[PDB]
Amino acid sequence: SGFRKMAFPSGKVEGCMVQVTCGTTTLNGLWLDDVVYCPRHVICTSEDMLNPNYEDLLIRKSNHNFLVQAGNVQLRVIGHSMQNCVLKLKVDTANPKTPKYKFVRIQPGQTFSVLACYNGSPSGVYQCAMRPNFTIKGSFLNGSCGSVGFNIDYDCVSFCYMHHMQLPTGVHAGTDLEGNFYGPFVDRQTAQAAGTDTTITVNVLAWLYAAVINGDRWFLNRFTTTLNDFNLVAMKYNYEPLTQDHVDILGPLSAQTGIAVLDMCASLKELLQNGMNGRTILGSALLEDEFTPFDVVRQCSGVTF
Amino acid sequence: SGFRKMAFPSGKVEGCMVQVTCGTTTLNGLWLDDVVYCPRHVICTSEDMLNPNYEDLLIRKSNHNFLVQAGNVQLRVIGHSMQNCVLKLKVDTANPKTPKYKFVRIQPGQTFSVLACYNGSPSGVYQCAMRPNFTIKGSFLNGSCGSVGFNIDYDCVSFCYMHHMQLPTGVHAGTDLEGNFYGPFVDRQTAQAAGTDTTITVNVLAWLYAAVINGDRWFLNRFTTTLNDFNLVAMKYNYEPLTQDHVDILGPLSAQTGIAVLDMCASLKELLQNGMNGRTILGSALLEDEFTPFDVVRQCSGVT
C-alpha cells in the first residue's frame, strides 16, 4: 500500500549523460549512439542571448570549440549541426551504454521523469507533469540545462523533454529531442508570457481513485452529475474541461473501485465548491494533478522494467 | 530555481537488485560482492507469519532451496546464514556491478531514496524520511519486500534500509542492512504499535529557508523567540524539540538568507498557532518535513 510520486529508474539514462562546454557556458548533453544532443544556446555568451542569430553564430564555431566529457573520458567531436533548437555533435565513439530509445513529443497533462544533472553528472530524479501551458515547475539550477525527461515503456526509453530555459516567472521551458519547444517559447533571453495555466482534471480524478484504493474515502458523496454541469464548475476554478476520452481513460480505475466516473466528478465538484476543510487526501492538503490514470494503474499493479 | 522532492539516481542500486525465491514466496534481494541480502521472512508461508520460529524454519532449508535470479542469470548458492532479520546467501559469483558502498544505520529525521522492486526488477524511485517513530510512509505492494533505501555521497552508496513489512496502520517498517529493525517492530504478522509520530522540526525550518531562497517570503514576521519558548509550542503541536545542534546545522542557510534561526523559529511558531489560512509555501498547503538541511543545501548549490 501507500502512494508516492514515483520517478522511473534512471539507470539507462545516467549512462547517456555527458558534459558539453563551449567558451564560458558548460551544460549537459545526451549521448546516444555516436551523437550528443544538447541545447543550441550552449554556443551563446551571456551577451549573445539577448538576441542571437544562431545560424551566424554556429558558422563561426568549429568542432574543436566543443569540449565533450563523459566522466573521465573526453570524446573527439568530428562534426556539428543544428536541428531546430538542439545541437547535434557527432563524435568518433558510439556510446556503448546506449539503451533502446525513441524520441516522443508528449501531450500537455502527460507526465515524465526528469534526471537533473550538473556538469554532465546525475544529481537526482523527480516525476512531473507537462502543464497545460507547456511549462514545468521543476528543479533547475545554473548548468542544469541539457537535462532530459523520459518515460520507460517496457524496455524502451522514450525521451520527451530537454530543459533549455528558466522564465522570469521561475517556471521552466524546453524542447522535444528534435529541438522543438513545447508551447510558445524561444531560446532567447526576453520576457515570455506563459499561458494561463489550468489544473489537469483527468489527473486529479485518477489521484482520487488512487486515494480510495489506499483506503482514503472521506470525500465520497452520494451525489452524481453530468459532463456539462461538472465542466461549468471546472471552468470557474480553471480546470481543464473533462471529455469522454478522459472518462474512457478512467474506466479501469472506475471498474476496480466500483465508483462511476461521473460519481467521482460529483465528489470533486463538492471539494472545489467547499474546499477540503483542512483535511488531507493521501497526505496532501490540496488536489494533486501530476498523476496520469496510467501512472496510478502502474503504481497499483507493481509494474517493473 | 524551483523546489522538488528529489530522489538520488538509482543506477548503481539497480545493478544490485536480484530476485530471491524459497518455496512459494518470491521477493527482492541485494547482491553485493559474492553475498545476496534479503528479508528472512522469505522462508515463511502465509500461515508461518502469524508466529514464526525462524531458527526451526531455516534449519529445514538447504542451499539449493534458494533460487536467486539476477535478470536472466541464475546464481549458484554455496552457503546461507541468518543475521538478525536478514538472510545472507553466499554465491559463487561476485556481482561485477558492485558499487562502492557502506552500510549505515540512519537516525530518525534523516532522509533517503527508495528503489521499489517486484521480482528483483526496478519499478521506480522516491525520496522519503525515517519518521521519529521509526516507520515510513511509502509505496510497497505484494513482493516489494527486499527493496532497499540508500543515499549517494559522490560514488559511494550508503544503504540504510531494507523493507520488510506493512503495519495494520498502513505504514511501513524494515531493517538496516545488518538485519536490525528500526524502532520496536518484529517480522511477525501481528498488531504493532508505532510510537506517537512527531514532525521533524529541523527539516521544516530547512524547508522554510528553501522557500525564502526561492522567493516565497509571505510567512516572515517581525517577531523572534528563544529555544525554550519555541519548544513549549513545539511540544504542544507534536514537533521534535529543537536543540543547538539543529540550530548549528541551519547556520549556512541562516547566513545566505540573512535570517536568524530563532527569527525563523518565530515565523514557524506563528504558523502553528494561526495555521496557514489556506495559503501555500512552495506549492504545498502544509508544512513539509521530509527535507533535511543537507537536502536543501544539496539542491541549492547544484551538487551531483
Side-chain angles (χ1 to χ4, degrees):
Chain A
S1 282
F3 202 85
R4 301 299 296 236
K5 193 115 68 165
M6 215 168 286
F8 292 94
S10 51
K12 293 159 187 290
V13 176
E14 289 169 57
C16 311
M17 297 315 294
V18 297
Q19 176 197 56
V20 184
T21 304
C22 197
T24 290
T25 320
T26 283
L27 50 51
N28 305 296
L30 186 68
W31 181 24
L32 302 169
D33 303 316
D34 67 347
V35 176
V36 169
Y37 303 78
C38 77
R40 68 173 174 169
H41 75 61
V42 69
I43 77 189
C44 300
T45 56
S46 206
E47 182 185 41
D48 289 337
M49 287 295 298
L50 177 48
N51 196 40
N53 186 319
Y54 277 104
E55 295 70 39
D56 286 344
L57 285 174
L58 181 61
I59 285 168
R60 300 212 294 257
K61 293 296 177 222
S62 298
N63 285 336
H64 64 90
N65 296 134
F66 293 111
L67 158 50
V68 183
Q69 196 109 30
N72 196 2
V73 188
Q74 280 180 55
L75 302 177
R76 185 109 48 184
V77 183
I78 69 175
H80 59 74
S81 60
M82 191 160 64
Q83 195 191 350
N84 305 303
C85 301
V86 298
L87 197 56
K88 292 195 294 199
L89 304 170
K90 196 190 188 56
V91 292
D92 73 352
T93 310
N95 187 358
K97 299 180 275 204
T98 298
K100 189 179 172 188
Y101 72 88
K102 302 213 260 94
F103 290 167
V104 162
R105 191 171 179 86
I106 51 168
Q107 312 300 125
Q110 282 305 121
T111 58
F112 55 95
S113 283
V114 170
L115 186 68
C117 303
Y118 303 90
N119 284 19
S121 294
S123 183
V125 63
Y126 57 96
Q127 183 86 3
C128 71
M130 175 65 74
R131 299 309 311 165
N133 70 353
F134 297 93
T135 70
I136 65 181
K137 309 215 279 293
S139 190
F140 292 107
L141 273 68
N142 193 334
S144 66
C145 295
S147 286
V148 294
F150 58 94
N151 281 275
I152 315 193
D153 310 281
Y154 174 51
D155 57 0
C156 192
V157 177
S158 283
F159 294 100
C160 62
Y161 186 76
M162 177 174 263
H163 176 71
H164 280 61
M165 306 264 83
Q166 183 162 295
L167 303 186
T169 81
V171 304
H172 305 112
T175 64
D176 63 10
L177 268 297
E178 288 174 325
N180 299 304
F181 266 93
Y182 290 97
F185 311 109
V186 297
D187 49 355
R188 212 137 62 88
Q189 162 177 5
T190 55
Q192 294 192 58
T196 292
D197 194 29
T198 61
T199 308
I200 306 156
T201 311
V202 67
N203 285 16
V204 171
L205 291 171
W207 176 74
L208 286 179
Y209 275 114
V212 172
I213 293 166
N214 290 283
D216 223 337
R217 323 158 285 106
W218 68 262
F219 54 85
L220 297 178
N221 61 32
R222 289 302 98 77
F223 312 139
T224 192
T225 195
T226 63
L227 222 58
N228 252 25
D229 295 323
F230 170 87
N231 278 346
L232 288 174
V233 181
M235 149 80 68
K236 182 182 164 200
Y237 290 90
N238 287 31
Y239 270 58
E240 248 184 23
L242 196 71
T243 73
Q244 190 59 41
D245 273 349
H246 296 141
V247 175
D248 291 337
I249 291 157
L250 289 163
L253 291 179
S254 174
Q256 193 184 7
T257 55
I259 303 163
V261 177
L262 294 184
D263 282 355
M264 187 71 90
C265 291
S267 295
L268 178 49
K269 188 194 282 173
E270 294 305 321
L271 289 163
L272 291 177
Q273 297 178 333
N274 306 324
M276 289 176 60
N277 266 131
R279 297 190 76 164
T280 69
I281 291 173
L282 292 170
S284 174
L286 40 72
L287 300 167
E288 302 297 354
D289 81 335
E290 297 199 332
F291 292 107
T292 64
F294 173 62
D295 292 0
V296 170
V297 172
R298 162 163 53 89
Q299 185 164 157
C300 287
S301 72
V303 178
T304 55
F305 313 93
Chain B
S1 282
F3 206 86
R4 303 296 299 240
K5 194 188 298 266
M6 217 168 299
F8 291 95
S10 51
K12 292 172 191 295
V13 177
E14 290 170 56
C16 312
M17 296 317 293
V18 301
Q19 176 197 55
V20 186
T21 305
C22 195
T24 289
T25 321
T26 284
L27 49 50
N28 306 294
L30 187 68
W31 181 23
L32 302 170
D33 303 317
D34 69 345
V35 178
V36 169
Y37 302 79
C38 77
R40 68 173 174 169
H41 72 58
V42 69
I43 76 196
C44 300
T45 57
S46 285
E47 181 169 327
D48 289 337
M49 288 295 299
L50 279 327
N51 195 40
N53 187 318
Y54 278 105
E55 294 72 37
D56 286 344
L57 288 174
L58 182 64
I59 282 169
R60 296 212 292 279
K61 299 292 167 188
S62 299
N63 284 337
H64 60 90
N65 299 135
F66 292 111
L67 315 177
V68 184
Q69 197 158 347
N72 205 357
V73 189
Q74 278 269 331
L75 305 175
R76 187 173 305 274
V77 181
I78 69 176
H80 62 76
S81 57
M82 189 161 63
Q83 194 194 350
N84 305 305
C85 302
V86 298
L87 254 289
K88 293 194 294 201
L89 306 168
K90 195 192 170 211
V91 292
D92 73 352
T93 310
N95 188 358
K97 302 183 198 169
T98 297
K100 233 102 55 150
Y101 71 88
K102 305 203 259 89
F103 291 166
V104 300
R105 189 174 181 85
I106 51 170
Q107 297 283 307
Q110 304 334 114
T111 58
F112 55 95
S113 283
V114 170
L115 184 69
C117 301
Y118 304 90
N119 307 327
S121 292
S123 186
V125 64
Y126 58 95
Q127 182 88 341
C128 69
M130 175 63 74
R131 299 309 311 166
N133 71 352
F134 297 93
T135 70
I136 65 178
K137 304 173 179 292
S139 186
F140 290 109
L141 299 169
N142 192 335
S144 67
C145 297
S147 286
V148 294
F150 60 93
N151 282 274
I152 315 289
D153 184 338
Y154 112 72
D155 315 304
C156 187
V157 179
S158 287
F159 294 99
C160 62
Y161 185 76
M162 176 171 267
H163 177 71
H164 280 62
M165 43 184 47
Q166 185 161 300
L167 303 187
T169 318
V171 304
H172 304 111
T175 65
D176 63 10
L177 267 300
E178 288 179 323
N180 291 115
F181 266 93
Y182 289 98
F185 310 110
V186 297
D187 48 356
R188 298 185 61 202
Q189 166 181 18
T190 54
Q192 294 194 58
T196 295
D197 194 29
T198 61
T199 308
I200 305 155
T201 311
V202 67
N203 286 16
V204 170
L205 290 172
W207 176 74
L208 286 179
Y209 275 116
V212 174
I213 292 165
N214 288 274
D216 223 335
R217 309 172 290 104
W218 68 263
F219 55 86
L220 297 178
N221 62 29
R222 298 174 176 282
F223 315 139
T224 191
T225 195
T226 64
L227 260 197
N228 277 2
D229 168 56
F230 170 87
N231 278 346
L232 289 173
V233 180
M235 215 278 299
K236 183 181 205 205
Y237 290 91
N238 295 107
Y239 269 59
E240 256 188 18
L242 198 72
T243 74
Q244 189 60 43
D245 278 340
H246 297 141
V247 175
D248 291 337
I249 291 157
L250 290 164
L253 294 180
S254 175
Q256 190 70 246
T257 55
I259 299 163
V261 175
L262 294 184
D263 282 355
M264 190 69 92
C265 289
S267 295
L268 177 49
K269 186 183 155 178
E270 295 303 322
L271 289 163
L272 292 178
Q273 297 178 335
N274 306 145
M276 288 176 66
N277 313 335
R279 295 200 60 111
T280 70
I281 290 173
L282 291 171
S284 173
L286 312 157
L287 299 169
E288 301 298 351
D289 81 335
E290 298 198 332
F291 289 109
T292 64
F294 170 59
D295 292 0
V296 170
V297 172
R298 161 160 90 262
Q299 189 162 159
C300 288
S301 71
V303 178
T304 289

